[PDB]
Amino acid sequence: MRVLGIETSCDETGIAIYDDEKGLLANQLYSQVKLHADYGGVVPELASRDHVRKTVPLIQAALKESGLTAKDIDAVAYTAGPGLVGALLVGATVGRSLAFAWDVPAIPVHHMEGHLLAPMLEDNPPEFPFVALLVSGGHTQLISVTGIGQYELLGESIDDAAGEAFDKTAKLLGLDYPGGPLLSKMAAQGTAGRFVFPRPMTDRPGLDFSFSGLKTFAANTIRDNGTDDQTRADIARAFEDAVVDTLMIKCKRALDQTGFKRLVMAGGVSANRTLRAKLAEMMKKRRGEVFYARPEFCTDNGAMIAYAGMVRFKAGATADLGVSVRPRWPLAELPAAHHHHH
Amino acid sequence: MRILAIDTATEACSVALWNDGTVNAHFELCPREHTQRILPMVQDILTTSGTSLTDINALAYGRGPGSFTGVRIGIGIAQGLALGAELPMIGVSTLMTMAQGAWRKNGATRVLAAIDARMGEVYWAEYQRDENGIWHGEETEAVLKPEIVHERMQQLSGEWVTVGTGWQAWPDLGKESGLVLRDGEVLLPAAEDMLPIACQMFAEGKTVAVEHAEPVYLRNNVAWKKLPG
Ligand SMILES: C[C@@H](O)[C@H](NC(=O)CP(=O)(O)OC[C@H]1O[C@@H](n2cnc3c(N)ncnc32)[C@H](O)[C@@H]1O)C(=O)O
Ligand SMILES: Nc1ncnc2c1ncn2[C@@H]1O[C@H](COP(=O)(O)O)[C@@H](O)[C@H]1O
Ligand code: NA
Ligand code: NA
Ligand code: NI
Ligand code: NI
Ligand SMILES: [Zn+2]
């Protein structure tokens, strides 16, 4: 069985082909970095425009890369949400009509479920149950995962997602949009403990997050200190260390509250090297295991969609001819289903 | 041939099929329902006409202008179908489709097409049909403020037919233009009126492969101001 997965939820066009026996047969990506860099954020209208330009040639490149023809595709899966309504509609309209013309089932996919299942594309995938730390640009959530579509929300951000927080602070540091990975490289050149940022919501018990207060602490440290490369790197490190320590403390609490020995980390921020190292470090001390996707499957991609597409197709999540997108879609709303990973 | 036409650029949702001699058409008002209605509409017209997607020679699509989302639904569906069934694509102007509609209804040969573009502007076009049925004026397509439409109207003469939502939004648009204006009785584009334009385009080999399909938005200043420097 093969599934063509389509990802167009934000500012990245991801196309992939997943074989349930052979694994991933193609993976294509177009990032809209250059388009949104000038504006310091994602302009939805420009994002939807670039998705139209890139969707079909990336479908074409993925069939060429895999040496596959139409008849080799068993189903078409597309991100139906969450994300930008305009961006989402491009992937979903192309995907639904392609499925119709190819005479194959169409699979609307939850983008956060794709992120959650991205470690299943690597060797030694996690077994159920596990705690999932979904940490991207749009979301920051803690989920108790007992199976496919059995997602209990343990905690979430009350304000800014860890992704937005990384991007907002990097903007203050003069870095271009999105600044999350650049702030990380800048942080590696900094002195440990030069500046100390707070670990928000770790004073009292609970699994909810807050990161807005960290931007404020960064702006106050920038204004009150030296303009040089070294002071900026120390600021970047104290910011990065504050986020990672907060995410680790919350994960510890989630694992202690659930009693689970498995931690899955996914979403764009799960590409962060300091976070991958700290969570791996914590899991070894607890005599548990950490699971993550390759850094390129942490950020928005088509591989996670063709995989979750394969899972939802075997579960029976098929769409009729209507095309529908959900800019907001809770992980709790997804139906319980079996996991046929073999 | 066989040409399938699709349009979702405005409040309307339409499908049409030219089965060589035969025209099967379906037009409906779809506010807030385009994505729910367009594929069942494509399937119905294929069922009705007794044609299969593989037996279609070209896919004609509403290239725009109009609603940004609407134009994209059109190109998105059309791209999916053309990629899936390996079909060439024909991008048809929604302003020219209305020009054709006015000719179909009452023989209008001189059409001033105006779509409400929102933001106080209209998508404007001056279309003139020759003896062989070709609409001249594709070069006049622009997103304009009513004062600039007035200026454009000052450089014209004679009798013209008005078509589109821009005349509905601005009924005094042609006031003191110095032209003779009659209602074209066309408010929205219909996929049925894309077919004769597309038949002509196919014959002339003015068809593109699915990767070359392009929308015509006319309005491109859609972003908030760029960062300082
Ligand atoms: C469309 C929505 O559903 C939405 N999608 C996204 O937010 C795009 P993402 O690829 O999942 O995550 C991008 C975020 O991940 C951050 N990031 C990426 N790599 C790094 C790095 N090494 N270090 C730190 N931050 C990093 C980056 O700054 C950015 O804010 C969502 O998943 O909610
Ligand atoms: N969330 C959405 N899901 C599906 N169709 C949509 C969505 N947003 C807009 N559309 C369609 O696009 C048309 C034009 O959108 P607008 O430019 O906002 O007037 C609407 O009348 C809807 O049929
Ligand atoms: Na096979
Ligand atoms: Na068919
Ligand atoms: Ni149906
Ligand atoms: Ni199971
Ligand atoms: Zn994402």
Reduced 3-state DSSP string for A232-292? HHHHHHHHHHHHHHHHHHHHHHHHHHHCCCEEEEECHHHHCHHHHHHHHHHHHHCCCEEEC
Phi/psi at B12 (5° precision): -85, 155
Range of the domain at A30: 1-128+294-342
List the determination method.
X-ray
Strand A106-110: give its sheet, edge to edge: A23-31, A12-19, A2-7, A75-81, A106-110
Distance from the Cα of A188 to chain B's closest Cα (Å) equals 27
A34-71 CB burial, b ≥16 within 10 A, e <16 = ebbeeebbbbbbbbbbbbbbbbbbbbbbbbeebebebe
- Tell me how many domains chain A contains: 2
- The closest of B67, B203, B68 to B134, measured between CA atoms, is B203
Strand extents, DSSP E, B8-141: 12-18, 23-29, 58-64, 89-93, 110-118, 121-129, 135-136
Residues B35 and A333: their CA atoms lie apart, in Å, by 22
How far is CA A209 from each of CA A122, A159, A231, A264, A275, rounded to the nearest angstrom?
29, 8, 27, 18, 16
Any atom of ligand 2 within 6 Å of the Cβ of B67: yes
Any atom of ligand 1 within 6 Å of the Cβ of A32: no
Do A15 and A66 fall within a single domain?
yes
Report whether A220 belongs to an annotated binding site: no
Q: Is the backbone of residue B41 left (phi > 0), alpha (psi -120 to 50) or beta? A: alpha
Q: Do A322 and B35 touch (CB under 8 A)?
A: yes
CA of B25 to the centre of ligand 3 (A): 40
- DSSP-derived letter for residue B91 is E
Helix pair angle (A273-285, A180-187), 10° resolution: 70
Q: Are A140 and A209 in contact (CB under 8 A)?
A: yes
Structure tokens at B148: 């600039």
Q: Do B69 and A89 touch (CB under 8 A)?
A: yes
Structure tokens at A264: 């899955």
Q: Are A16 and A27 in contact (CB under 8 A)?
A: yes
Beta bridge partners of B93: B64
Structure tokens at B17: 């099929």
- DSSP-derived letter for residue B226 is P
Query: What amino acid is encoded at A181 in this protein?
Result: P
How many other β-carbons are positioned within 10 Å of the β-carbon of residue B152?
A: 17
Residues B166 and B186: their CA atoms lie apart, in Å, by 11
Distance from the Cα of A219 to chain B's closest Cα (Å) equals 19
Do A123 and A29 fall within a single domain?
yes
Helix pair angle (A44-66, A85-101), 10° resolution: 30
| List of chain A residues whose C-beta atoms are within 8 Å of the C-beta of residue B84 | 70, 97-102
How many other β-carbons are positioned within 10 Å of the β-carbon of residue A26?
A: 25
| List of chain A residues whose C-beta atoms are within 8 Å of the C-beta of residue B75 | 52
What sections of chain A are H helices per DSSP? 33-37, 44-66, 85-101, 111-117, 162-172, 180-187, 212-223, 229-258, 273-285, 303-315
Do A241 and A140 fall within a single domain?
yes
Q: Which residue of A has its CA nearest to B212?
A: A53
- The closest of B96, B112, B206 to B159, measured between CA atoms, is B112
Q: Are B125 and B140 in contact (CB under 8 A)?
A: yes
Do A264 and A134 fall within a single domain?
yes
Do A67 and A169 fall within a single domain?
no
Q: Are A305 and A217 in contact (CB under 8 A)?
A: no
Distance from the Cα of B29 to chain A's closest Cα (Å) equals 16
CA of A324 to the centre of ligand 2 (A): 10
Do A150 and A245 fall within a single domain?
yes
Q: Do A93 and B77 touch (CB under 8 A)?
A: yes
Residue B36, burial from CB neighbour count under 10 angstroms (0-12, 13-18, 19+): middle
Q: Which residue of B has its CA nearest to A89?
A: B73
Do A101 and A9 fall within a single domain?
yes
Do A167 and A280 fall within a single domain?
yes
Do A142 and A278 fall within a single domain?
yes
Any atom of ligand 2 within 6 Å of the Cβ of B219: no
Report the SS3 class of residue B170: coil
| List of chain B residues whose C-beta atoms are within 8 Å of the C-beta of residue A89 | 35, 69, 72-73, 76
- Within 13 Å, how many C-alpha atoms sit on residue B183's CB side? 8
Residues B97 and B116: their CA atoms lie apart, in Å, by 16
- The closest of B94, B155, B161 to B128, measured between CA atoms, is B161
Mutate to test the pocket of ligand 2, among B10, B34, B36, B219 (most ligand atoms within 8 A of CB): B34
Under 8 Å CB-to-CB from A256, ≥6 apart: which residues? none
Do A284 and A136 fall within a single domain?
yes
Any atom of ligand 2 within 6 Å of the Cβ of B70: yes
Q: Are A84 and A115 in contact (CB under 8 A)?
A: no
- Within 13 Å, how many C-alpha atoms sit on residue A159's CB side? 11
Residues B68 and A329: their CA atoms lie apart, in Å, by 24
Q: Are A239 and A245 in contact (CB under 8 A)?
A: no
Structure tokens at B93: 């102007």
Do A142 and A286 fall within a single domain?
yes
Q: Are A337 and A156 in contact (CB under 8 A)?
A: no
Residues A215 and A240: their CA atoms lie apart, in Å, by 11
Q: Which of A52, A70, A321 has the CB atom closest to B43's CB atom? A: A321
A interface mutation test: which of B33, B35, B61 has the most A CBs within 10 A?
B35
Domain closes at, from A276, A293, A310: A293
